[PDB]
């Protein structure tokens, strides 16, 4: 599953439909990024630029011109074809092939952007620009506007209005097309297979980074070369560190390991967390904390639907957590009073859910306290956790336990679809899986 | 093998020994780097900062103060310990533990750098600063100097002299300690095992990126989490593109695949290229080009020693190439005349060797045309190649063939040691390896 | 005559009336400017900031908030009162006195602008900002918007729309109130008295800068401390250099001197040019060129009225010039053909008229080729000139003659009012004035 | 008196003599400065650039190359000759005439600086650059060094050492040549004539700015077009504000007026303060404060000589002030105890003396608390003052009195020469002068 040329074109037209007549929208590619000295990180296209193009080169700018309410056209600035650069660093789309390949009306060399952009903006009323996103893009836009402001003797005029297109575009991204959902479904399946593999390979004495290697190998073999975020493999006390990415420790018999990892597939993020015993068997204490986190997740999965909100479902989770922690003696008091004082927060200190898409923490307005009413087409995570610090003032057997369990879902007309339920999370199913792998 | 605290301290003292009395050297950590939106790339410490510290955090600055010819001391600025940041994003060294851990005299919070740096530079004659390396570092240094210049009423004085320490430090890095050579030896072995694995796993119909996944998995399992540069897997015509990193094509029965990949192990780069038949058997044409590149490499490996140079060895390679290409009819004419007109250059268009170390294209002065005389302790690559474009005006059977074969060596008192000879390169040994793997 | 508090308030309200509901306009003061080292030029307030405030301090920002269509209010950021700064550098308005003095609703310390501006912009739809006018102002606005964009967890929202208020404000400035016309009338009278004085004081052997001194002394004595632009005193060949400001030469018996000078009175510019014989008597050649320039000006003064344009009046001037130059043999050919080839341009190479107000080259849209139809309340200059280079291919006696004659006018319902006719320009009146002064 | 070509050349050679072999010094012109919109302030050349050139154009850079200990040469970058720019904005020196005019070896177009500077710095060991002085200059230098650092394949090398030439050059400027002293002597005489004129013209009912106009007219007529700093005319309570430049008030019968004004003559500053009765007659109270300030100045003038210091002479002044203030009841206590508690500071809150030259607050190291031992050739001001605030807790008759009296001196082998004693300061001489002028 992928997003095709025709869909990128639909998205461009949908933006144009929201634009004022006599306007242009400017969407810039990500800069290349240095890793060390002359070596660069593998290129990651800007998500919004990607959303409108599926084009994975730097030094590119998409310009959508809406001349009036019936007439509009697109211009791409992109790197020229060049024999030498290409023998060295790889093939480039160039200007001749871009209109057909990407479905844009015209393509021009990026090297000509300062000579051409002001001419495209001349006489328009509005420019849509994500100001502050990239310095290089701001310099280009500001230069063009300055040329226009200062060019009345050449009969040039600058648009007086600049509108940040990010609110509009991010609202577009918040609601996934069926094709986007198919891509995310595949991302979830690829990520789930990776997590299953990690559970089947995990043994005491392996390093945390060994499970990262298994996971990334599984991503790669399904054509998801890169993770959507830095993989977390937190065994023992490291599980209580939320974005532990060192993954440098030997995994001990008797500890849990929390793995949070997700692929990037055709631009889209998977995002799964599973926590499991390194030796294949939960201790009583581990199981007691695990069951509360799993109940939180299972309840959330039953509830998420159109018409509720992250805030509302979070309230149910908080009650489940406070109740379970009181029962174990980790919290003490009256449940409702404890809820009223947010007594869960030392152990569950993050949000239950974030939007998911071209970024793992995807764009889109949440509303105050994530109160926005859910509608079909929204994609979000569900990730309750409990983290009991090594020095927490709690019954000793719970200290140093960090558990999160995270699935990715799409809101549908009838509730939700779980994209990541193909990797197990019930404790008895985890143990069975690991027992089977451990027998060879 | 690794580099220890005591060695980082030796390097600091060796810099200090080269410093003027009444001076301070400022060495800044790399900034964190955005991958997309709020997600960052896995952190890569600046190589020179690493060289003096082995410390893998951002927002850190090493200050070496040489008060006079007998007295000197070190101050580290680094991130404070902070409960919340640490629960979220991970553990930090902090100020209390840094002096013992890193072997510095004093540690201060990075948040205090603007309040403290000018006081450390007050009254010194010289500041050593790699100006232009990082914008954030330049801002900090320029602010401190401005405070001093403008603070005569507070009895402050700025050092009038600023010296770029990069020439001195890069000359230090050019000559490896025995411990560094041990680390590089391990990098070479890890990288070689990865390349062997790729040869054993490769089958027609696999995607180029599948071999990248095998390679990166092998790096990881030996504790080299990250590659030292973006892996190249160039099959068929893609082999003629020097830094082909798309690795997106299905590998065809009958094509060669060129794999250029290297691990980063304790900061140090491996860098190996092997080219081999996708189906396990060189065609006659492939073998004919391969033999010229292999002869170039084997001859270079015999020759490299103290007292020669990359330039001198390159001349021998050029003769081997021109000779072989004439013999095959790819070039036509008199060998010596062809050499005199650099007739090899359409097919061998890059350098034979680059320095290797904490960067894959390592620091250090090459001399004009890489004429610097080699000495023991220098580490370099040897990477002849021949690339015959799909449309080259040559006998048809050679078109679209891209071959490079690259080993990493250390110059020793008696010649060189090949760090990467544990992965095969003789064509009959490649075929035997692949025949054996292909039988299961 | 001046502009009062109530008028600045009217202007603020007129801007607000043009603003969208749910918006704020930000108007920044000019930065102080270094002359040398720690010495600054005398402060000149930004013209648009001045237009809305009459406030002559730096580090000030006017914020006009239009909450909706009935409710609006103003906030000033300005320097705090401070005993020491004030003993040293002078009195400051401060926060307590500003609301009454300036007629703003609230005043806050400039030192708090970054802590307060984002709170004023939170939740608005539109921000009006003259982007690119000042770097310091851009930094402040961009920081505030970034805080808002990034502050959704604090329930902050940034306005997505930024509109340059300069087009609207400059259209306001283009049409003068009766009070503004009274100020400009006084500026014209002060400037005229200065030019009369220069004519009465001028003698061969005086330096050009001596007339500048007379002029600036006369400005000052009427309470116009500063000129509105750098004074030009171009004698002999220097008259052919349009913005000759060196004023360094001894004025010779037999040469003309061109003086272009204007006062700045309550923010408003005068702008007068007179050219006259250094020795009090035009030569025949000088008089011949002078008469053409004077005819051009007198005709322009008869013509300028509502319903014509600078372009239309320029055409009449061009015909007068071509005709006169043909008659003298400076041009040769058919007048209409010469006009059609713009043959006057080597001798008259600038515009006839520019708008006049708070800047000498005042703001406001001219239309293509200055074709905008004139309306009452517009204020402009009328400044024909002829400049015959020392090496021009023309009858010898005309070489090195530079003449401009410039008056300032206001368009009225019935034509125009000449604000600067109190300094003579008819050649016989110039000679009479100078003859009288030269007798003592 | 002026500074000639040969002296600018001597200064260049004296810098070169202090430079390391294999080095270049870069001295940049001041940028032009905006006054409002498209109008600029009258150009003021950077003092250090002026010191080495006497050249009053922007977009110019002096490059002094010291190839080794015997061979050196100079290159100027400066604006090209251009017909149109010159018809408009004035004459430019250009490249052809510069070597002879300025006495430099070579001149190149400023437009070529980025193409040429790196070639001049290639292979040198040291670059002398006043980093942080001007942004435009820093950009140019940083670009050149970056080209060199990154150009090893083109056999380019950057100098690793950058030295701020300001300490060396400012020490040069601290010691005046006999020619510089002659220029300063003339500056002092011009300034003194201006102050005499102000005393002779001053009448109750005139505005403070009227005396500014008289002063600036007198500067101008002697060929000092511009003041060296913004003129202060502080009558009544305004005299207690140290840099009162508003000069906006009507001068009252019964008040003193403090005038601090100085010309700029051939680049060099005068700096004189005189305080006198607006009505020509000191009141008893005014005279009582005046006598203490005059005693302070007369004593300082007797004392200043080689071998003393500003600090030492300041101590004598402080004693004079404390003594006089005790005698009048403004201070109460034991003189020595009062001195020990710096009890004078509410009334005398600034320094007694600053260096004087191409800047009014001239460059040069003062030593801690201005303790540097004075030597012949140093030029400084002597400016005791007493300022009694309107609300000071002192005998009523002294409130609102601000008096400073300031002369400019040169240290000589035998003491000092007073450059500004030609304007009176004894109270009886002030009254006599004013009585005579007031009679007509
Ligand atoms: Cl391009
Ligand atoms: Cl910190
Ligand atoms: Cl403030
Ligand atoms: Cl130029
Ligand atoms: Mn996750
Ligand atoms: Mn998540
Ligand atoms: Mn390689
Ligand atoms: Mn290599
Ligand atoms: Mn004018
Ligand atoms: Mn004009
Ligand atoms: Mn003074
Ligand atoms: Mn002074």
Q: Which of A201, A348, A181 is nearest to A268 (CA)?
A: A181
Same domain for B123 and B213?
Answer: no
Distance CA D401, CA C305 (A): 57
- Give the whole-angstrom CA distance, residue B103 versus residue B4: 11
Nearest to C163 among A142, A160, A167 (CB): A160
| A265, β-bridge pairs | A268
Sign, CA dihedral A199-A205-A211-A214, equals negative
Q: What is the CATH number of the domain that holds B325?
A: 3.90.230.10
CB A378 within 8 A of CB A305: no
| Cα B230 to Cα A36: distance, rounded to the nearest angstrom | 12
**Long-range contact pairs involving D68-72 (C-beta distance under 8 Å, separation at least 24):** D68/D21, D68/D22, D69/D21, D72/D16
C236 and C127 assigned to the same domain:
no
Angle, in degrees to the nearest 10, between helices C284-303 and C310-328 = 160
- HSE on the CB side for D406, CA within 13 Å? 28
Residue B167 corresponds to which tokens in the numbers above?
């020439």
Contact D259/D233 with Cβ under 8 angstroms? yes
The burial of D204, by beta-carbon neighbours within 10 Å (0-12 exposed, 13-18 middle, 19 or more buried), is given as: middle
**SS3 state at C8:** helix
Whole-angstrom distance, CA of residue C286 vs CA of residue C298: 18
A163 with A228, same domain: the answer is: no
- DSSP at D95: H
> What's the CA gap between D120 and D127, in Å, rounded?
10
Comparing CA positions, the residue from C140, C55, C68, C66 lying closest to residue C99 is C55
Same domain (yes/no): A55, A191: no
The residue among B3, B6, B19 whose CA lies nearest residue B63 is B19
Question: How close, in Å, is residue A300 to chain B by CA atoms?
Answer: 24
Q: From which experimental method does this structure derive?
A: X-ray
- Is the alpha carbon torsion for B435, B436, B437, B439 positive or negative? positive
Question: Using alpha carbons only, how large is chain B's radius of gyration in Å?
Answer: 25
Closest CA to C239 of C324, C347, C356, C395: C347
Strand partners for A416: A411
B260 labelled binding-site residue: yes
Closest listed residue to residue B261, CA positions, set B250, B251, B249, B275: B275
Torsion (CA) A358, A359, A361, A363 in degrees, nearest 10: -60
| Pairing label, strands A106-109, A72-78 | parallel
Question: Which secondary-structure segment (H or E) carries A265?
Answer: strand A263-265
Which of A42, A210, A240 lies closest to B230 in CB terms?
A: A42
Query: In this structure, what token pair is assigned to residue B288?
Result: 């004919």
How far apart CA B60 and CA A376 sit, in angstroms, is 47
Phi, psi (5° rounding) for residue B78? -160, 165
Give the single-character DSSP code of B224. Answer: -
As a whole number of angstroms, the distance between CA C232 and CA C229 comes to 9
Same domain, B216 and B290: yes
Compute the distance between CA of residue D71 and CA of residue A140 in angstroms, rounded to an integer: 46
Chain C neighbours (≥3 Cβ pairs under 8 A) are A, D
Burial group, residue B6, by CB count within 10 angstroms (0-12, 13-18, 19+): exposed
- Strand pairing report for D407-412 and D401-404: unpaired
Partners of B40 in the beta sheet? Answer: B34
Is the Cα dihedral D4, D5, D10, D15 positive or negative?
A: positive
8 A C-beta contact, residue D437 and residue D301: no
Closest C-alpha to C361, from C379, C375, C347, C349 = C379
- Residue C413 CA to ligand 5 center (angstroms) comes to 74
* D101 plus D228 within the same structural domain: no
Instruction: Give the ligand with the smallest distance to the CA of B405.
Output: 7
> Measured between alpha carbons, how far is D298 from D296 in angstroms, rounded to an integer?
6
In three-state secondary structure terms, D27 is strand
Does residue B139 belong to the interface with chain D, where contact is any CB pair within 8 Å? no
Which of B117, B147, B173 marks a domain boundary? B173
Scanning C109-177, the segments in alpha helix (DSSP H) are: 113-121, 135-149, 166-174
Rounded to the nearest angstrom, the gap between the alpha carbon of residue D213 and the centroid of all alpha carbons in its chain is 21
Which two three-digit tokens encode residue B58?
């951002």
Encode burial over B354-363: b for 16+ CB neighbours within 10 A, e otherwise: bbbbbbbbbb
Where among B173, B201, B227 does a domain terminate?
B173
Query: Taking a C-beta distance cutoff of 8 angstroms, is the pair B294, B427 a contact?
Result: yes
Q: Torsion angle of alpha carbons B325, B330, B336, B340, nearest 10°? A: -110
Residues A155 and A196 in one domain: no
Same domain, C127 and C258: no
Was B112 annotated as part of a binding site? no
> Which residues neighbour A370 within 8 Å (Cβ) at sequence distance 6 or greater?
A309, A310, A311, A314, A351, A353
Number of domains, chain C? 2
List the single residue in B212, B244, B359 with the smallest CB-CB distance to A90.
Answer: B244
Partners of C65 in the β-ladder: C24, C73
H or E element at residue B114: helix B113-121
Question: How far is residue B26 CA from its own chain's centroid?
Answer: 23
Q: Which residue of B has its CA nearest to D152?
A: B368
Q: From the candidates B166, B197, B222, B361, give the one annotated as an active-site residue.
A: B361
Beta-sheet pairing, B401-404 with C23-28 = unpaired
Q: B420: CA distance to ligand 8 center in Å?
A: 12
Return d(Cα A324, Cα A330) in angstroms, integer. Answer: 9
Residues 202-221 of A with CB under 8 A from B: 207, 209-210, 212-214, 216-217, 220-221
A253 and A324 in a single domain? The answer is: yes
Spatial separation of the C-alpha atoms in residues C364 and C370, rounded to whole Å: 11
Q: What is the distance in A from the centroid of ligand 7 to the CA of B361?
A: 9
* Contact present, C164 and C241 (Cβ < 8 Å): no
User: Cα distance from D72 to chain C (closest Cα, Å)?
Assistant: 30
Check if the beta carbon of residue A366 is closer than 8 Å to that of residue C152: yes
Q: What is the dihedral of CA B209, B213, B215, B216, to 10 degrees?
A: 130
Residues A296 and A164 in one domain: no
Give partners of D (≥3 CB pairs < 8 A): B, C
Residue C17 has, within 13 A of its CA and on its CB side, a CA count of 8
Compute the distance between CA of residue A135 and CA of residue B80 in angstroms, rounded to an integer.
Answer: 30
Which residue matches tokens 């996708």?
A: B278
Q: Provide the 3-class DSSP secondary structure of residue C38.
A: coil
In whole angstroms, what is the distance from residue B283 CA to residue B247 CA? 23
The strand pairing partners of A275, in sequence order, are: A258
* Two structure tokens written together for B33: 């780097």
Task: Give chain C's radius of gyration (CA, Å).
Answer: 25
Separation CA A134–CA B68 (nearest Å) = 45
Looking at B156, B173, B190, the residue that finishes a domain is B173
Three-state DSSP at C1 gives coil
| Cβ atoms of residues A318 and A349 within 8 Å | no
Rounded to whole angstroms, how far apart are CA atoms B7 and B182?
A: 13
Query: How many other β-carbons are positioned within 10 Å of the β-carbon of residue C83?
Result: 8
Q: Which residues pair with D259 in a beta bridge?
A: D233, D274
Q: How many CA atoms lie within 13 A of B154 on its CB side?
A: 12
Q: What is the largest CA-CA distance in chain A?
A: 83
Report the run of H or E that residue A338 belongs to, with start and end. helix A335-340
Bridge partners (DSSP) listed for residue C25: C64, C128
What angle do the packed helices B427-438 and B284-303 form, to 10 degrees?
120
Please give the structure tokens belonging to residue B102.
């890193």
Query: What CA–CA distance (Å, rounded) separates A143 from A161?
Result: 16
Rounded-to-integer distance, Cα A58 and Cα A78, Å:
8
User: Which of D127, D148, D153, D157 is the mutation pick for testing B, counting most B CBs within 10 A?
Assistant: D153
CA distance A230 to D223: 72
Q: Nearest bound ligand to CA D95?
A: 4
H-helix or E-strand spanning residue C40: strand C39-40
Residue A18: CATH number of its domain: 3.40.350.10
The CB-side HSE value for A227 (13 A sphere, CA atoms) comes to: 23
List the structure tokens of C160.
């997505």
Please give the helix or strand (H or E) that residue B74 lies within, else none: strand B72-78
CB B223 within 8 A of CB B183: no
Strand runs (DSSP E) across B185-331, as ranges?
226-227, 232-235, 256-261, 263-265, 268-269, 272-277
CA–CA dist C127, C19 (Å, integer):
10
**D338 & D310 share domain:** yes
Report which bound ligand comes closest to the CA of B78: 2
Distance of CA C249 to the CA centre of its chain: 27
Would you give the end-to-end CA distance of chain A in angstroms? 34
Nearest CA to D285 out of D427, D128, D92 is that of: D427
Is residue A168 located within the same domain as residue A191?
Answer: no
Catalytic residue IDs of C? 38, 243, 260, 271, 350, 354, 361, 383, 387, 404, 406
Partners of residue D437 on adjacent β-strands: none
Chain B residues with beta carbon closer than 8 angstroms to that of D149: 132
Domain that holds residue D123: 1-173
C4 CB neighbour count, 10 Å cutoff: 11
Q: Tokens at residue A309, please?
A: 């909100």
Does the beta-carbon distance from D142 to B131 stay under 8 Å? Answer: yes
């Amino acid at each position: 599953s992928e997003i095709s040329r025709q869909e990128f074109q639909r998205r461009r037209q949908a933006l144009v439909e929201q634009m004022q007549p006599g306007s242009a929208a400017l969407i810039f590619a990500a800069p290349e990024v240095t890793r060390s000295a002359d070596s660069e990180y593998p290129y990651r296209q800007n998500s919004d630029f990607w959303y409108f193009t599926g084009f994975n080169e730097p030094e590119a700018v998409l310009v959508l011109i809406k001349s009036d309410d019936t007439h509009n056209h697109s211009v791409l600035f992109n790197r020229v074809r060049d024999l030498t650069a290409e023998i060295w660093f790889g093939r480039r789309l160039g200007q001749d092939a871009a209109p057909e390949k990407l479905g844009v009306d015209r393509a021009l060399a990026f090297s000509e952007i300062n000579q051409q952009l002001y001419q495209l903006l001349n006489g328009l009323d509005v420019v849509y620009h994500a100001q502050g996103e990239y310095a290089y893009a701001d310099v280009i836009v500001n230069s063009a506007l300055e040329k226009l402001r200062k060019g009345s003797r050449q009969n040039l005029t600058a648009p007086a209005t600049m509108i940040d297109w990010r609110p509009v575009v991010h609202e577009m991204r918040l609601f996934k097309s069926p094709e986007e959902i198919a891509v995310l479904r595949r991302a979830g399946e690829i990520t789930a297979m990776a997590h299953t593999r990690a559970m089947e390979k995990c043994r005491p004495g392996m390093f945390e980074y060994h499970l990262e290697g298994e996971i990334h190998h599984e991503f790669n073999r399904h054509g998801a070369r890169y993770p959507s975020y830095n993989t977390i493999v937190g065994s023992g006390e490291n599980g209580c560190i939320l974005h532990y990415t060192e993954n440098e420790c030997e995994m001990r018999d008797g500890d849990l390991v929390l793995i949070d990892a997700g692929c990037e597939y055709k631009g889209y993020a998977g995002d799964i967390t599973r926590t499991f015993p390194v030796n294949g068997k939960f201790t009583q204490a581990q199981r007691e904390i695990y069951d509360i986190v799993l109940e939180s997740l299972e309840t959330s999965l039953r509830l998420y639907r159109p018409g509720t909100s992250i805030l509302e479902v979070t309230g149910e989770v908080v009650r489940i957590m406070v109740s379970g922690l009181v029962k174990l003696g980790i919290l003490k008091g009256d449940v409702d009073e404890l809820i009223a004082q947010n007594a869960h927060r030392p152990f569950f200190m993050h949000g239950l859910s974030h939007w998911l898409g071209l970024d793992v923490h995807d764009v889109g307005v949440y509303g105050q306290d994530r109160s926005r009413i859910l509608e079909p087409g929204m994609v979000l995570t569900v990730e309750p956790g409990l983290y009991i610090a090594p020095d927490a003032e709690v019954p000793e057997q719970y200290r140093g336990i960090g558990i999160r369990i995270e699935d990715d879902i799409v809101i549908t007309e009838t509730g939700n679809e779980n994209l990541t339920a193909s990797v197990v999370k019930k404790p008895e199913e985890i143990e069975a899986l690991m027992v089977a792998a451990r027998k060879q």
